[PDB]
Design an enzyme around this catalytic site. Structure first.
Site, PDB file in Angstrom:
ATOM      1  N   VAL A  87      44.258  41.912  36.308  1.00  0.00           N
ATOM      2  CA  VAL A  87      44.357  40.687  36.645  1.00  0.00           C
ATOM      3  C   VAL A  87      44.289  39.602  35.006  1.00  0.00           C
ATOM      4  O   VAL A  87      43.286  40.319  34.348  1.00  0.00           O
ATOM      5  CB  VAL A  87      43.521  39.961  37.550  1.00  0.00           C
ATOM      6  CG1 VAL A  87      43.431  38.265  37.919  1.00  0.00           C
ATOM      7  CG2 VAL A  87      43.725  40.433  38.906  1.00  0.00           C
ATOM      8  N   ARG A 110      40.519  33.669  41.225  1.00  0.00           N
ATOM      9  CA  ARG A 110      41.622  33.179  42.260  1.00  0.00           C
ATOM     10  C   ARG A 110      42.081  34.181  43.420  1.00  0.00           C
ATOM     11  O   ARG A 110      42.956  34.017  44.036  1.00  0.00           O
ATOM     12  CB  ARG A 110      42.761  32.944  41.429  1.00  0.00           C
ATOM     13  CG  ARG A 110      43.454  31.651  41.865  1.00  0.00           C
ATOM     14  CD  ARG A 110      42.795  30.542  41.338  1.00  0.00           C
ATOM     15  NE  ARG A 110      42.713  30.423  39.672  1.00  0.00           N
ATOM     16  CZ  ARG A 110      43.863  30.056  39.086  1.00  0.00           C
ATOM     17  NH1 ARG A 110      44.847  29.773  39.487  1.00  0.00           N
ATOM     18  NH2 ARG A 110      43.451  30.116  37.515  1.00  0.00           N
ATOM     19  N   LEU A 121      43.073  37.288  43.174  1.00  0.00           N
ATOM     20  CA  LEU A 121      44.340  37.905  43.053  1.00  0.00           C
ATOM     21  C   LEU A 121      44.076  39.438  43.345  1.00  0.00           C
ATOM     22  O   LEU A 121      45.040  39.971  44.052  1.00  0.00           O
ATOM     23  CB  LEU A 121      44.840  37.867  41.539  1.00  0.00           C
ATOM     24  CG  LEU A 121      45.928  36.614  41.401  1.00  0.00           C
ATOM     25  CD1 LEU A 121      45.632  35.514  42.067  1.00  0.00           C
ATOM     26  CD2 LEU A 121      46.178  36.411  39.803  1.00  0.00           C
ATOM     27  N   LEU A 122      43.039  40.060  42.859  1.00  0.00           N
ATOM     28  CA  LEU A 122      42.770  41.513  43.261  1.00  0.00           C
ATOM     29  C   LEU A 122      42.685  41.783  44.671  1.00  0.00           C
ATOM     30  O   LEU A 122      43.100  42.602  45.043  1.00  0.00           O
ATOM     31  CB  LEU A 122      41.317  41.836  42.463  1.00  0.00           C
ATOM     32  CG  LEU A 122      41.098  43.353  42.610  1.00  0.00           C
ATOM     33  CD1 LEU A 122      41.995  44.356  42.144  1.00  0.00           C
ATOM     34  CD2 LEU A 122      39.648  43.455  41.905  1.00  0.00           C
ATOM     35  N   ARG A 123      41.862  40.856  45.611  1.00  0.00           N
ATOM     36  CA  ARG A 123      41.767  40.963  46.958  1.00  0.00           C
ATOM     37  C   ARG A 123      43.018  41.030  47.501  1.00  0.00           C
ATOM     38  O   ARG A 123      43.309  41.811  48.424  1.00  0.00           O
ATOM     39  CB  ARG A 123      40.878  39.872  47.296  1.00  0.00           C
ATOM     40  CG  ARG A 123      40.599  39.989  48.715  1.00  0.00           C
ATOM     41  CD  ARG A 123      39.730  39.065  49.469  1.00  0.00           C
ATOM     42  NE  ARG A 123      38.197  39.557  49.379  1.00  0.00           N
ATOM     43  CZ  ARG A 123      37.584  40.616  50.082  1.00  0.00           C
ATOM     44  NH1 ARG A 123      38.164  41.078  51.115  1.00  0.00           N
ATOM     45  NH2 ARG A 123      36.415  40.859  49.460  1.00  0.00           N
ATOM     46  N   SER A 136      37.102  51.247  36.828  1.00  0.00           N
ATOM     47  CA  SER A 136      36.857  50.518  35.244  1.00  0.00           C
ATOM     48  C   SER A 136      35.456  50.254  35.382  1.00  0.00           C
ATOM     49  O   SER A 136      34.656  50.233  34.467  1.00  0.00           O
ATOM     50  CB  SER A 136      37.638  49.500  34.898  1.00  0.00           C
ATOM     51  OG  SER A 136      37.453  48.341  35.984  1.00  0.00           O
ATOM     52  N   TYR A 147      34.962  48.052  43.522  1.00  0.00           N
ATOM     53  CA  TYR A 147      35.799  48.753  44.721  1.00  0.00           C
ATOM     54  C   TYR A 147      35.026  48.793  46.134  1.00  0.00           C
ATOM     55  O   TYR A 147      35.708  49.092  47.030  1.00  0.00           O
ATOM     56  CB  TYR A 147      36.497  49.843  43.950  1.00  0.00           C
ATOM     57  CG  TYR A 147      37.747  49.143  43.284  1.00  0.00           C
ATOM     58  CD1 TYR A 147      38.764  48.864  43.728  1.00  0.00           C
ATOM     59  CD2 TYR A 147      37.584  49.480  41.670  1.00  0.00           C
ATOM     60  CE1 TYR A 147      39.854  48.098  42.807  1.00  0.00           C
ATOM     61  CE2 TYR A 147      38.544  48.925  40.807  1.00  0.00           C
ATOM     62  CZ  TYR A 147      39.700  48.420  41.435  1.00  0.00           C
ATOM     63  OH  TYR A 147      40.649  47.781  40.543  1.00  0.00           O
ATOM     64  N   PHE A 169      43.486  58.841  36.448  1.00  0.00           N
ATOM     65  CA  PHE A 169      44.551  58.007  36.642  1.00  0.00           C
ATOM     66  C   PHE A 169      44.234  56.597  37.005  1.00  0.00           C
ATOM     67  O   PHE A 169      45.185  55.742  36.770  1.00  0.00           O
ATOM     68  CB  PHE A 169      45.299  58.600  37.872  1.00  0.00           C
ATOM     69  CG  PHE A 169      44.930  58.778  38.816  1.00  0.00           C
ATOM     70  CD1 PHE A 169      44.930  57.513  39.839  1.00  0.00           C
ATOM     71  CD2 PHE A 169      44.200  59.823  39.526  1.00  0.00           C
ATOM     72  CE1 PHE A 169      44.131  57.911  41.243  1.00  0.00           C
ATOM     73  CE2 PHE A 169      43.377  59.866  40.818  1.00  0.00           C
ATOM     74  CZ  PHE A 169      43.229  58.593  41.464  1.00  0.00           C
TER      75      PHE A 169
END
Ligand SMILES: NCc1cccc(OCc2ccc(Cl)cc2)c1
Ligand SMILES: NCc1cccc(OCc2ccc(Cl)cc2)c1
Ligand SMILES: NCc1cccc(OCc2ccc(Cl)cc2)c1
Ligand SMILES: NCc1cccc(OCc2ccc(Cl)cc2)c1
Lengths: 396, 396, 396, 396
Positions: free
Chosen positions: D81, D88, D90-92, D115, D120, D396
């Site tokens: 993001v 805001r 965005l990840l959800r 990260s 998560y 990855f």
């Protein structure tokens, strides 16, 4: 496991073992240049069958010893055993074969720089020079009233680009190496290598500059990470005036906090300042190691102190024979005898005495040197001392 | 500002200046014990009117010089100028008055330990011993096959409480200080002080232990913050066997990673190990400083190397007179002359040569010593060298 | 060198060797208190004649093993060889004599805490618990929605002075040590010692506080030098609620940046937070070491996992005999046999399996455990696992 | 803000967000190679209108789970993001859209590397493998008498250039990843990337070497700044002999002080040495995270421990349904039910149990797993344990 002289096909395998063994590995291009100093039959390899698991070689060098005498010297280098083949006697076998070839070829001495201090003693190498790092906090450094070149008028020293004054550096170094015990003749290919390392490298060393005097030079670069430290890679001065003039210029590097140099224990720099303590000893290590291959040829070749009167003794080297040793008027005669030994020592110990870096008295106090006569000790100390302090020329 | 000998009433003021000047200030109780070594008229103070803004004193010491000769020595100590009174010439005035009293009293030499390296040169003190810190990573340390006392059977060394063997330490030290140049006679009050510092202090030093041999001792303590470092405060060995036996015991301290000691450059310890490099030089500094008060009395008092033949020269000390100097059979005669000088140097330089710690050749290369004869240099170097390496006894 | 049980006169000499051997030496007063746990004939000394050059002893302890079974345990401690007497076989001789007395006295197991990891393996001690240091950056720490005791209303935890709640700490610890493998019964004299160490020391540890719950306590102190670190010396929780309630209180120490504790690998703390990674593993080491003195008594004494079906094998301990081992319904029978071995291992390896800290499969992959049957490995792993995770009680 | 599958024109914008988000950003060339593993419709972007303020994608992977079963796995990666668009949702939104596509496409599991540890959990990912860094001080390391391959004669291990033995590395890794839970199939493009990173970079990583055995390899390089540290990037051993032979070779790197590797908690290396403590745990972190997308498909797919007898329970996953779970003979059946739950947990917790890295008992003690039956806990712990220890394949 077979030990044989390396063929042309083995060099890529030898370069692979080198790359994996030496973090300071100079690279295949540089390796190919130093290799012009290796004679025919100067290299051995061990093959597992097949691949290179061991290597060792010697270079043809010229080493200055006390009395300004130059000896042919076998310089061991590029010595590596694969991490897969430890504790199999490979180093012992490679050193025995090269020592045989070095002795048959007529070298009176072999020499090396040791990766560790505990390995080469048992093969007859004694540490023979001492590296002494001085770090000067140049912000406090003031020259003593007595120091040379304190007068007004033009400096005799110039700041120059090393690559544009190759001839002058070569001639000053040639004069230096012939007058100082530990001096090594530097061939053209090693000047090619030295001037190539003086360029800046992207993400590597910064640019090298030179300070040039008619009778001396200093090569220096700012340290890659500590931007207030200048490291002098090499200072070669033929006169005390050149040495003092170059240090006045280095202490004029007003951007720096500290100047460091790897020099010798008898460097007069501290005595040039009003505060001797500003020239701090930050590191001390063995430099060049010597193996005396032929005891009588080596003992007769070097000069001795004129200040000790004529004396005679019998020296036994533990596996190197017994000799009647007579030292007088700065010269030794060293002849076979079966007469009772007055002094005994291992071969490595003789290497440590040979250039004057270590006193016989100091080695005797460790029982590395054995005699029942303390007068003979004092005479040996005085006779093996070097008038010109021992310096280290360049690593190999 | 008036300079006068201190009265009993001034000592509290002198102790206040001491506390503010010396972070290592030994405290009023300890100060009162060292003060038994100060003679009548051995101390000066400067009063602002009123309060103490300056002080300096000397102690009556006995200093061993080459040839096992013991000189009466004035040991300067407790030298302080108030931070309120810098740059007013107080140190220069105090040193001139004490030097006058020291010379009138008949001392041939004065001595001190310098807080900084740039102060005492100009009053005629030259650094005369070298402190060399060795740190051994004892986890790798193995004794050489040649090292003494490698045999099976009882150790000759005992681990003891220092306070329970005072007599044995006193006798071993007395034997040590008489045979080593730099040795200082240690009076009873300084043994009282040394044994008191060997007890643990709450939030301070840990307990001191001793290793005791018939011919040597080591006093050591674990460092207060680095719990894997043992610091040897003092190792005194009269024989090579005692020195080796004590180092075998210290390397048996299996709880420790490192053993450190402040020793001298000629300590044979490195030569006792299979890896000489394990005995790392971690620090180097001037130790004892000497001022030669009477050039001829000092030059005739010490012994010289027997290995140099008889020679004669003329030495000028910059403000110390000109002398015909004849050295032969280990003895000097040093008589007034107006004949032309062959060697010139400042008084401090003579102090730096006097115990053999610095070579005349090294000082000459810095132009601190001036002659036109390089043969005379070699003869001076050889003659002033000490057979027994110079050591530092204890700070004052 | 003679090995004998120590007399009353030897204790001052034993305290001197202790002081010189153990930087964490608890002092003669504390030593005298732990010494009430040493039985008659529980100590040996080696005398050079004369003085103490070696010592070792065992204490009478009670050790909880899987199945909540309490074994009499010989706790070796105060083991020291003088630095003067290394490499003379003194530790081997002292351990053989104590092991003989421990086995004759009827102990099924001996135990110790190891100063180094390379010494006790060869005398049959295997590391049997794992110390795991967690450091929490408590400024980021938030409890998971699922974590117990997130409700509003009074805290069940109180901040108290340790010395004023001795009875409550004693009862909570007694309940803890009986239910956890690795638990050690703590006698009154060790509670006297623990509460004495909870006071501040001038220039030493800061004051200890306690957090007290009906079913658990934490003892903590601010680190002496890092003033933003709280170190938990000991947290004993009998219920998951007590463990969670105590960690909520510790993460309420708003003055601190970090909370550290030496705990076990299965500590649920990380799972209590929304970010498991905040509970960082900063250090991992062997804790308690076990020597199985009587293989059959030890194997039959502990409980086994009920989840593995009945199986039979033949176990050989390298110098400890061969046994028919049948494990079923959580119980073992272990009887003499000369039938062919299906599993072989050294005695130390059995100690490492005994409390469930190490898997047989892991030791087999290192060839420390040898079998040709991988099904038998899986069965051994499952059977020796501990339902209640192994913890370390307190060092000795 | 609109969430849509990215077009070809968006990749430069996605590479810009990547460069600004990931300090370890592999570069556009490498990104283009990994991108061959992203399926059609495997990527989402958020556009502010216009420009990329959010992105996320999954790759098609194959993950080995206990019982040597290989599952199709959606590997989330390249999640970012813009720093302009935090807080805001965005990840959800991006995770909900990819999870929908992953579940509709038929994947039973998704996976990622986190990260940070706090992000998560709330989207149903549980940490499922543990990274364990071991640092060995190889100067002290000696192999135990029991360790394999201690015999004389040729080493089975060769030092090689990685790029010249690609085929052998590929075949050894293929065998490794199929037999170890956590193994990931490595496609040709990831071998192209791995061998390209093994070359030295100017001002970057030093050259990588390999140690090659018929049944294992190690890739290592000297650390860029600490020249006495070798970092093993990857060691893959199919047999215990290969693992031991490779560690003998790594401990033969006599230039190094330390060898470090990121391995798993059950690495047998410590047990290969006479001093287990030399293999120090210097770092511990979550590795691979799992989201179970289809509870019944995942639970029936993996194998279970044969050592636990048949049992039946009812498991509720907080938003993942309720199932009758029967485990016997190493196999599970998992069918819909409305019968009362005996075990409850959030989806992330099931991911943390799934490969055997975390015990049900440990999660229960944190109340992340809830049951009133302690016998059922013991049975779950035993059944979900992995015979072959869980390892982490590649990030990855
Ligand atoms: N220790 C760094 C260093 C410094 C200078 C030269 C050096 O290798 C010399 C050498 C290299 C390759 C060959 Cl075929 C022969 C000799 C190593
Ligand atoms: N530099 C630390 C140190 C070490 C030993 C003695 C010392 O002071 C000596 C001294 C102190 C007070 C007096 Cl009246 C006379 C002499 C200082
Ligand atoms: N390693 C520190 C430590 C911690 C606790 C106890 C300890 O000594 C135990 C002990 C001391 C003296 C005696 Cl006679 C018997 C036992 C050492
Ligand atoms: N965390 C470093 C790291 C290591 C390996 C791969 C990696 O990105 C994988 C990736 C990159 C770009 C794309 Cl389009 C798809 C996947 C990142």
């Amino acid at each position: 496991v077979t030990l044989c002289s390396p063929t042309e096909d083995d060099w890529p395998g030898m370069f692979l073992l080198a790359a994996a063994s030496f973090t300071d590995f100079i690279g295949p291009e540089s390796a190919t240049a130093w290799r012009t100093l290796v004679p025919t039959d100067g290299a051995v390899v061990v093959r597992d069958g097949s691949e290179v698991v061991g290597m060792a070689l010697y270079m043809d060098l010229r080493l200055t010893v006390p009395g300004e005498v130059v000896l042919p010297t076998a310089g061991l280098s590029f010595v590596a055993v694969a991490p897969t083949h430890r504790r199999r006697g490979l180093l012992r076998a490679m050193c025995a074969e090269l020592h045989r070839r070095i002795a048959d070829s007529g070298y009176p001495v072999a020499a090396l720089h040791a990766s560790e201090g505990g390995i080469y003693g048992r093969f007859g190498y004694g540490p023979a020079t001492t590296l002494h790092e001085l770090t000067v906090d140049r912000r406090f450094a003031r020259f003593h009233a007595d120091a040379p070149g304190g007068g007004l008028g033009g400096s005799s020293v110039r700041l120059v680009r090393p690559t544009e004054h190759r001839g002058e550096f070569e001639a000053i170094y040639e004069r230096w190496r012939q007058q100082v015990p530990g001096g090594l003749l530097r061939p053209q290919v090693l000047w090619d290598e030295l001037l190539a390392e003086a360029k800046a490298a992207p993400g590597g060393d910064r640019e090298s500059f030179a300070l040039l005097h008619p009778d001396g030079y200093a090569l220096y670069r700012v340290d890659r990470t500590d931007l207030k430290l200048a490291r002098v890679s090499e200072l070669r001065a033929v006169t005390a005036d050149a040495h003092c003039a170059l240090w006045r210029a280095l202490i004029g590097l007003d951007s720096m906090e500290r100047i460091s140099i790897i020099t010798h224990p008898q460097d007069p720099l501290p005595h040039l300042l009003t505060d001797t303590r500003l020239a701090r000893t930050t590191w001390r290590q063995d430099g060049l190691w010597l193996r005396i291959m032929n005891v009588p040829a080596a003992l007769e070749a070097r000069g001795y102190a004129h200040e000790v009167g004529e004396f005679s003794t019998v020296l036994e080297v533990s596996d190197g024979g017994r000799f009647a040793l007579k030292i007088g008027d700065g010269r030794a005669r060293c002849t076979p005898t079966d007469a009772a030994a007055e002094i005994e020592m291992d071969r490595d110990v003789l290497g440590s005495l040979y250039l004057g870096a270590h006193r016989a008295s100091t080695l005797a106090a460790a029982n590395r040197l054995r005699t029942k006569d303390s007068q003979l000790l004092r005479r040996l100390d005085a006779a093996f001392a070097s008038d010109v302090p021992v310096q280290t020329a360049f690593e190999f």
